[PDB]
């Protein structure tokens, strides 16, 4: 997310076009975007086409034009000169394709080469008509799109979704790296900058969880502090963990400490889970997802989120506010975790409604009711000329207090005018995975969790191994993202390992396989790049040769399908099911942020309707289309009660509450207050609006 916020080309802003006034022609992909802007990665909201991303190899001119590199070919021989061409010069020449064959010196093998001509034309020209060539396939894609394995088997809508969901994944507490990745994950992790990189070679002298000090080759040393448990801009955690031992020799540019979402230096946004691609009893109907309880017990998809709460004690007209334990009339139960200046103790558990900072403001003099004065005279309490306005934990939140940062005026901290003290409290909590949370893979396959089953009622292999996630079959073929199925197949082969039997020579499907992809050990990490990767013939061969588990028991056959048992009935499922290892990641759309409710809360000021938003209590909106649905049903009483004594009827709101609490019948409604505000605005435009009797 950080690296893709830079390298962003937004077409809107002060000096460029608006969003509503922008045509449908500037939101298009043009053939001069090849190598300069990514056709895939763009928002899917009402900004599609107006925000894009720079491609991987692209440069920017002195004048502001985007260039892209090309290999100069002369007399049909592709040389190693790299020329950076902007779109005009590219229109003047004719540019080949990066995967056209080469006869080991640069000379083209085929007689006619597929090219790109001046207007977006694609033709076949003779091999000496060509005068440039792309430096790579995946020249046209961006950073977040070059991390989708098997991209050319996914449709462009689902690739757009996958690239945009890849930068919403949250950092987990352990963070392992994918079995099948592309090669982009290392460079996107070093270049993003959340990794600590050794600036100069040396030998590690002393490691702790807080620092690494390396001693360079000429006497001098350098210590690198780590950022432990720091709140990012969006609430997540920003841990940094060393990965070097205490006598290790490091080199310049070597990753010396990890980051939020990296494992051994490369970007790791999710976890590798064992998947089954069946339907299962309706619990994964229409993109819902079934999960194991192992992922809750073993903290697989668990993440840490930090919140920051701030109060300040400034000067008023009637005196100065102060931060104190001596709050007005509340019990000594709720003053238990507060230290002797009115702030919470570090380590203390807080619930919704607990005092964090005890503040009090000077109130002045008011007239008390006779009932309140009689109660004060009975119980002997005093007036308490100060009014309690403390900082409390908001609704639905909890966690442990992990840090307090207090600034003061008398200690010459730079606070704004009026403010005498400022206190910040940090409350961190560790969130397990629960249903309602949203997960995704890299191929655009999102979905909320519907059920978290026990381990024992999960489909299991003949080994006894339960599956970890169940995904539905009906969602795959109408979306055209079988990159997820080919990733599942390769992930099973990378988990189990393989060995190609080159006894009677290399088999015919493995003629173009690189050597030492001809065998792999269990849990091998492999990499299929974007437009140059593993073919389907190679996936077929690697499925047909793969290692047994512990006994000689090849559990997944040559089609990629396994025989499973039902965890509840015990009987075997009657047909083989596709299993493998898909790399899924947990998205920042969790239930604990989404849920709100309200019975009665804050109201607006001019019109007296509820405020809106989860940050308030906040009402839900009942708009025009909902009113038309109520009128179409015929529900005059439901519609009237929603539009009067639940929004605007200021004297009817209170009688409704009193009638519910006393158990009576809900009273009759009155005039909404927005109608009276309308009549006063119509009168103040010099119109004589009047209500008549009969």
């Amino acid at each position: 997310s950080g690296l893709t916020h830079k390298r962003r080309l937004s077409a809107l802003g002060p000096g460029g076009l608006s969003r509503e006034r922008a045509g449908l022609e500037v939101r298009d992909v043009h053939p001069s975007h090849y190598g300069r802007m990514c056709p895939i990665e763009t928002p899917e909201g009402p900004n599609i086409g107006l925000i894009g991303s720079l491609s991987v190899y692209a440069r920017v001119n002195p004048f502001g034009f985007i260039e892209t590199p090309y290999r100069k070919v002369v007399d049909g021989v592709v040389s190693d000169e790299i020329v950076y061409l902007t779109a005009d010069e590219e229109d003047r020449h004719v540019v080949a394709q990066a995967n056209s064959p080469i006869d080991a010196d640069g000379r083209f093998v085929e007689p006619r080469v597929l090219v790109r001509r001046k207007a977006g034309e694609v033709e076949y020209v003779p091999s000496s008509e060509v005068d440039y060539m792309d430096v790579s396939p995946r020249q046209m894609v961006s950073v977040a799109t070059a991390m989708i394995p098997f991209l050319e088997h996914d449709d462009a809508n689902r690739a757009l979704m996958g690239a945009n969901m890849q930068r919403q994944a949250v950092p987990l507490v352990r963070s392992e790296a994918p079995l099948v990745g592309t090669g982009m994950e290392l460079r996107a992790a070093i270049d993003a900058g959340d990794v600590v990189v050794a600036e100069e070679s040396g030998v590690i002298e002393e490691v702790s969880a807080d620092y690494i000090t390396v001693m360079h080759d000429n006497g001098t040393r350098r210590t690198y502090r780590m950022r432990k448990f720091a709140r990012s801009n969006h609430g997540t955690c920003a841990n940094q963990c060393p990965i070097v031992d205490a006598g290790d020799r490091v080199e310049a540019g070597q990753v010396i400490a990890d980051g939020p979402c990296t494992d051994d230096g490369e970007m790791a946004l999710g976890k590798n889970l064992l998947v089954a691609i069946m339907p299962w009893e309706g619990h994964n109907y229409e993109d819902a997802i079934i999960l194991s309880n192992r992922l809750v017990e073993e903290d697989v998809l668990t993440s840490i989120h930090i919140e920051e709460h701030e109060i300040d004690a400034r000067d008023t007209k009637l005196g100065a506010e102060e931060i104190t334990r001596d709050i007005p009339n509340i019990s000594d139960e709720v003053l238990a975790d507060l230290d002797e200046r009115g702030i919470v103790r570090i380590g203390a558990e807080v619930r919704d409604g607990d005092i964090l900072v005890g503040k009090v403001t000077p109130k002045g003099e008011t007239e008390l009711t006779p009932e309140e004065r009689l109660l004060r005279a009975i119980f002997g309490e005093k007036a308490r000329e100060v009014r309690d306005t403390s900082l409390k934990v908001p609704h639905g939140e909890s966690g442990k207090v992990i840090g307090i940062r207090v600034f003061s005026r008398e200690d010459e901290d730079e606070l704004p005018a009026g403010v005498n003290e400022l206190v910040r409290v940090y409350v961190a909590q560790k969130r397990k995975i629960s249903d309602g949370d949203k997960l995704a893979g890299r191929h655009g396959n999102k979905g909320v969790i519907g059920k978290i089953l026990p381990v024992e009622d999960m489909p299991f292999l003949a080994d006894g191994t339960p599956v970890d996630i169940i995904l539905n079959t009906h969602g795959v073929p109408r979306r055209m993202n079988i990159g997820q199925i080919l990733e599942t197949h390769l992930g099973w082969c990378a988990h189990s390992g393989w060995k190609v039997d080159a006894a009677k020579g290399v088999p015919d499907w493995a003629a173009r396989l690189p050597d030492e992809l001809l065998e792999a050990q269990p849990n091998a990490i492999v990499s299929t790049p974007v437009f140059d990767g593993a073919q389907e013939a190679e996936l077929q061969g690697l499925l047909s040769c793969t290692l047994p588990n512990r006994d000689g028991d090849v559990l997944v056959d040559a089609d990629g399908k396994a025989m499973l048992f039902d965890g509840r009935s015990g009987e075997p499922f009657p047909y083989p099911v596709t299993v493998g290892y898909m790399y899924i990641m947990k998205l920042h759309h969790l239930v604990d942020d989404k849920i709100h409710a309200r019975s009665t809360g804050p109201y607006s000021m001019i019109t007296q309707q509820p405020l809106g938003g989860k940050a308030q209590f906040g009402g839900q909106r009942f708009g025009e289309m909902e009113c038309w649905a109520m009128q179409a049903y015929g529900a005059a009483y439901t519609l009237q009660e929603l539009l009067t004594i639940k929004s605007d009827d200021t004297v009817g709101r209170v009688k409704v509450y009193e009638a519910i609490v006393k158990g009576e019948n809900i009273p009759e409604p009155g005039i909404p207050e927005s109608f009276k505000v309308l009549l006063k605005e119509l009168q103040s435009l010099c119109l004589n609006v009047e209500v008549l009797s009969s």
Partner: peptide
């Protein structure tokens, strides 16, 4: 390769790369 302590991730790719990826914050 070209990163001094990178983990060995074996590649299915078939083509040689003439140009390395630039700095991505240039």
């Amino acid at each position: 390769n070209s990163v001094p302590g990178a983990p060995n991730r074996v590649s299915f790719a078939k083509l040689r790369e003439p140009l390395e990826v630039p700095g991505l914050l240039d």
